[PDB]
Amino acid sequence: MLIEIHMIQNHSPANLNRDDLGAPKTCYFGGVLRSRISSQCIKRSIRTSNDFKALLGGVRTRRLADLIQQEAGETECWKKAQEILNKCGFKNKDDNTKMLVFMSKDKIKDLARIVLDNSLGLTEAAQQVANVIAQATLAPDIALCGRMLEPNDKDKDKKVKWSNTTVEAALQVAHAISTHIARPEIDYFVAASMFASACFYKYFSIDWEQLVKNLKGDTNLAAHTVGAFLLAAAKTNPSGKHNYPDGILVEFKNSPISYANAFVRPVSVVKESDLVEQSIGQLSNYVNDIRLGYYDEQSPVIGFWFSPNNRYPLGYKHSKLASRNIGNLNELVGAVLDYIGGFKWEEVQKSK
- C-beta of residue 149 within 8 angstroms of C-beta of residue 129: no
Q: 171, 179, 239, 172: which is closest to 27 by C-alpha?
A: 179
Q: Alpha helix (H) ranges present in 51-103?
A: 64-68, 79-88
Does 315 help bind a copy of itself (rule: CB under 8 A)? no
Q: Which entry of other proteins, a copy of itself, none binds 75, CB below 5 to 8 A by partner kind?
A: other proteins
Q: Is residue 344 a contact point for a copy of itself (CB under 8 A)?
A: no
Among residues 196 and 302, whose Cβ is nearest to other proteins? 196
Tell me: does residue 289 bind a copy of itself (CB under 8 A): yes
Interacting span for a copy of itself (CB under 8 A) from 14-22, 71-79, 158-166, 214-222: 14-22
Residues 43-72 interacting with a copy of itself (rule: CB under 8 A): 44, 50, 59-63, 66-67
- Could you tell me the smallest distance in angstroms from the CB atom of residue 132 to other proteins? 20
Residue 36 binding a copy of itself, by CB under 8 A: yes
Angle among Cα 34, 36, 39 to the nearest 5 degrees reads 150
Site for other proteins in 225-284 (CB under 8 A): 241
Q: What string of H, E and C letters represents the secondary structure of 65-124?
A: HHHHCCCCCCCCCCHHHHHHHHHHCCCCCCCCCCCCEEEECCCHHHHHHHHCCCCCCHHH
206 DSSP β-pair partners: 3, 171
We find the least distance from the C-beta atom of residue 119 to a copy of itself, in angstroms, to be 30
The amino acid at residue 218 is: D
DSSP label of 119: T
Cβ of 190: how many Cβ atoms within 10 Å?
A: 6
Q: Which of a copy of itself, other proteins, none interacts with 241 (beta carbon under 5 to 8 A by kind)?
A: other proteins
Question: If binding is defined by CB under 8 A, does position 294 make contact with a copy of itself?
Answer: yes
Single-letter code of the amino acid located at 19: D
Q: CB-side exposure of 230: number of CA atoms within 13 Å?
A: 26
DSSP 14: G
Nearer to a copy of itself, 157 or 246 (CB): 246
Count of residues touching other proteins (by CB under 8 A): 31
Beta bridge partners of 325: 305
* Residue 69 site contact among other proteins, a copy of itself, none (CB < 5 to 8 Å, cut-off depends on kind): other proteins
Contact of residue 205 among a copy of itself, other proteins, none (CB under 5-8 Å per partner type) = a copy of itself
Strands 101-104 and 198-207: unpaired
Answer yes or no whether residue 257 interacts with a copy of itself by CB under 8 A: yes
> Are the C-beta atoms of residues 266 and 35 closer than 8 Å to each other?
no
CA-based torsion, 16, 173, 256, 327: positive or negative: negative
* CB of 141 closer than 8 Å to CB of 57: yes
Under the binding rule (CB under 8 A), the answer on residue 99 touching a copy of itself is no
Distance CA 276, CA 287 (A): 17
Radius of gyration (C-alpha) of the chain in whole angstroms: 24
* Residue in 200, 203, 304, 343 binding a copy of itself, rule: CB under 8 A: 203
Span near a copy of itself by CB under 8 A; candidates 85-93, 135-143, 150-158, 189-197: 189-197
Q: Are 165 and 134 in contact (CB under 8 A)?
A: yes
Taking CB under 8 A as the criterion, the residue among 118, 154, 192, 318 binding a copy of itself is 192
* Residue 194 interacts with other proteins (CB under 8 A): yes or no: yes
Measure the CA–CA gap between 42 and 216, rounded to whole angstroms. Answer: 26
What is the DSSP pairing of strand 176-178 with strand 32-37?
A: antiparallel
Give the per-residue contact string, 60-79, with other proteins (x = CB under 8 A; - = no): -----xx--x-----x-xxx
Site residues for other proteins, 163-192, by CB under 8 A, read: 181-189, 191-192
- Letters for 20-59 (x = contact with other proteins by CB under 8 A, - = none) are xxxxx-x-----xx--------------------------
Stretch that binds a copy of itself, among 71-79, 86-94, 215-223, 305-313 (CB under 8 A): 305-313
CB 61 within 8 Å of CB 101: yes
The residues of the shown chain that bind other proteins, judged by CB under 8 A, are 13-14, 18, 20-24, 26, 32-33, 65-66, 69, 75, 77-79, 181-189, 191-192, 194, 241
